[PDB]
Amino acid sequence: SRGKICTIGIAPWGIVENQEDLIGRDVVRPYQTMSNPMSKLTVLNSMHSHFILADNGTTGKYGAEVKLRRQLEKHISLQKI
Amino acid sequence: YTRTQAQHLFIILMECMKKKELITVFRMGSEGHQDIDLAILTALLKGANASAPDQLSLALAWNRVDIARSQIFIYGQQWPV
Numbered sequence: 001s002r003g004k005i006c007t008i009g010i011a012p013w014g015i016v017e018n019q020e021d022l023i024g025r026d027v028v029r030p031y032q033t034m035s036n037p038m039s040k041l042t043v044l045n046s047m048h049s050h051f052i053l054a055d056n057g058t059t060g061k062y063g064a065e066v067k068l069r070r071q072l073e074k075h076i077s078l079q080k081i
Numbered sequence: 082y083t084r085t086q087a088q089h090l091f092i093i094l095m096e097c098m099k100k101k102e103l104i105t106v107f108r109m110g111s112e113g114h115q116d117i118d119l120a121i122l123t124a125l126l127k128g129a130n131a132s133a134p135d136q137l138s139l140a141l142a143w144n145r146v147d148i149a150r151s152q153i154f155i156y157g158q159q160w161p162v
Contacts (some may be wrong), residue, residue, distance in 0.1 A: 037157075037159055
């Protein structure tokens with residue numbers, strides 16, 4: 001089918017498989033999709049048209065974005081259609 | 082069918098059922114793999130006790146892509162480097 005869905009993925013920054021390969025600013029960065037289970041991390045799921053990476057300094061632990069996501073949802077709910 | 086209970090193949094049948102790891106049974110409607118060519122080919126991959134790349138090479142040799150799609154490429158395979 002044609003068309004595009006504006007899928008927004010808010011993820012904790014500390015769980016991406018490549019902290020590097022993403023430091024480049026305002027430039028295109030290639031990214032691998034093959035997933036290996038000995039890294040104890042997870043790759044970013046492809047075909048998500050927008051990514052928001054939230055960090056609090058930690059690495060390898062969840063819970064770093066639930067507050068941000070909930071606040072963003074609440075603020076969007078206050079926006080006027 | 083044989084010489085009554087005076088002579089029986091029950092011990093050898095029980096030994097075969099003790100080695101039932103390789104047995105594959107076809108039955109219409111009751112089980113899956115209703116296609117014989119699907120069932121006869123799954124036995125070679127399963128019973129070889131080979132790793133994933135070996136079975137992938139086997140599927141490449143046989144030029145059967147659906148089997149490697151539905152059997153080899155599933156969750157949790159951990160291919161070597």
